[PDB]
């Protein structure tokens, strides 16, 4: 199998119009879990989570998230006091781990205030990088608690990876499947003076795809226009790459997807 990841986000909003607090988990690109201050319930966002986790998992994470919602509200208020900030600001957390293709693992923990990097954890040095002087205040309090640092390292390296592996199995039929891209090249007079070659891929899962244009099969082209990997709405994805050319060199589109390389010459 390829790289997989498990990520959990927290968003807090002071004086919403919007919920005060939302939490969502993701395995790769797939929402698996949700919770907000309005439902006050942890719910599955994937059928294969609903079907493999007994009610007591949802009931127990419901209670933990009610806790995290309260801690986040208090923490946010504190950050706005530290800043002399009034009215609405956002506190954000992201925790997660990757199980890479080579079996090696990563872990990350970071916070954002109003969508900016506030605090980033290094689980190797057991330390928080602070962007400013209020960050550097929280850095201190946090780095004074060795039990918390070590708990976090252990969470990211052992628990997170064990959860990710648990959820990978539950969702294998979705997460470890391949829908190979359908790729078409066409040549279009797009506008007056402009003739272009489009290499368009769609129907693909997973979303990670590399598309480029080659000249005489040697040189990668420098002037390529790229279409974002975009969700099609059916659980598959679509993307393109295009180059402009002299109406009269052999150009080739190269697509790499899920361990398969594909060449289309015009």
């Amino acid at each position: 199998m390829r790289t997989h990841s498990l990520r959990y986000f927290r968003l807090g909003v002071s004086d919403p119009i919007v919920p005060e607090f939302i939490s969502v988990g993701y395995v790769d690109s797939h929402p698996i879990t949700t919770y907000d201050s309005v439902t006050r319930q942890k719910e599955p966002r994937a059928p294969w989570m609903a079907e493999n986790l007994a009610p007591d998992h949802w009931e127990r994470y419901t209670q933990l998230l009610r806790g995290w919602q309260q801690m986040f509200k208090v923490e946010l208020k504190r950050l706005q006091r530290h800043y002399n900030h009034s009215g609405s600001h956002t506190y954000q957390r992201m925790i997660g781990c990757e199980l890479l293709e080579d079996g090696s693992t990563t872990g990350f923990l970071q916070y954002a205030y109003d969508g900016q990097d506030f605090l980033i954890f290094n689980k190797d040095t057991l330390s928080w990088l602070a962007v400013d002087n209020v960050a550097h205040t929280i850095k201190q309090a946090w780095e004074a608690n060795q039990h918390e640092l070590l708990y976090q390292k252990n969470w990211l390296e052992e628990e997170c990876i064990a959860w990710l592996k648990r959820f990978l199995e539950y969702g294998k039929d979705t997460l470890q499947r391949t829908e190979p891209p359908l790729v078409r090249v066409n040549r279009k007079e797009t506008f007056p003076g402009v003739t272009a070659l489009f290499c368009k891929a769609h129907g693909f899962y997973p979303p990670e795809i590399y598309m480029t244009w080659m000249k005489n099969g040697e040189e990668i082209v420098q002037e390529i226009d790229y279409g974002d990997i975009l969700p099609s709405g059916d659980g598959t994805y679509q993307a393109w790459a295009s180059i402009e050319l002299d109406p009269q060199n052999l150009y080739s589109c190269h697509v790499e997807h899920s361990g398969v390389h594909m060449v289309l010459q015009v």
Partner: antibody
Amino acid sequence: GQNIDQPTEMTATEGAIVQINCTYQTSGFNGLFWYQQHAGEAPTFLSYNVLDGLEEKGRFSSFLSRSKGYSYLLLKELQMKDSASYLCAFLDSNYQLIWGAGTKLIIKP
Amino acid sequence: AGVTQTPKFQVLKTGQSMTLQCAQDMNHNYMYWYRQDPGMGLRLIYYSASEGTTDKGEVPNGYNVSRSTTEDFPLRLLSAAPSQTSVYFCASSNREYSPLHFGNGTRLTVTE
């Protein structure tokens, strides 16, 4: 998040050393605690281990092997005041706190 | 600071109701109620992850709780039974994984 075993009772001489073993079986782990409870009083926190190894705090040390499902609380230069029950507890993957039945430590003068 | 648990001692008749009170001034989110019985580990009756929520522990039957505030976590005995003769400990913790701070206990005896 299943099982935890410690000795019911240990007896050692004042001035000497005791090692209180705690063995645990779990699928999921967020750390192992030692608490001290004197006769007729509330438990108080002694130690936390989550990574493999030895943490020293004065006369008291707490060891964890995560792979062997194994912790010990080591008490040096035993005093009469160390007489008390020692409670081993661990957190499972869901932060359930599973408590040992406790070990009663009897110090002989 | 710490955990203030009352009463320290209590005798009840079979069938009588009571409330053990428990207050902490530490801003802790987590409060717990345990019973301690000879030869077994602490058994959780109910817990509260924060103000506005509560959930059952391992031995909730015959008890109830409220957590309308951060500070207080009261334990209600519905109908005193002799099986409820025990020492009750209130506890708080900053977080689900942080150390517990305990109250000084309630020694409770229920007689017919």
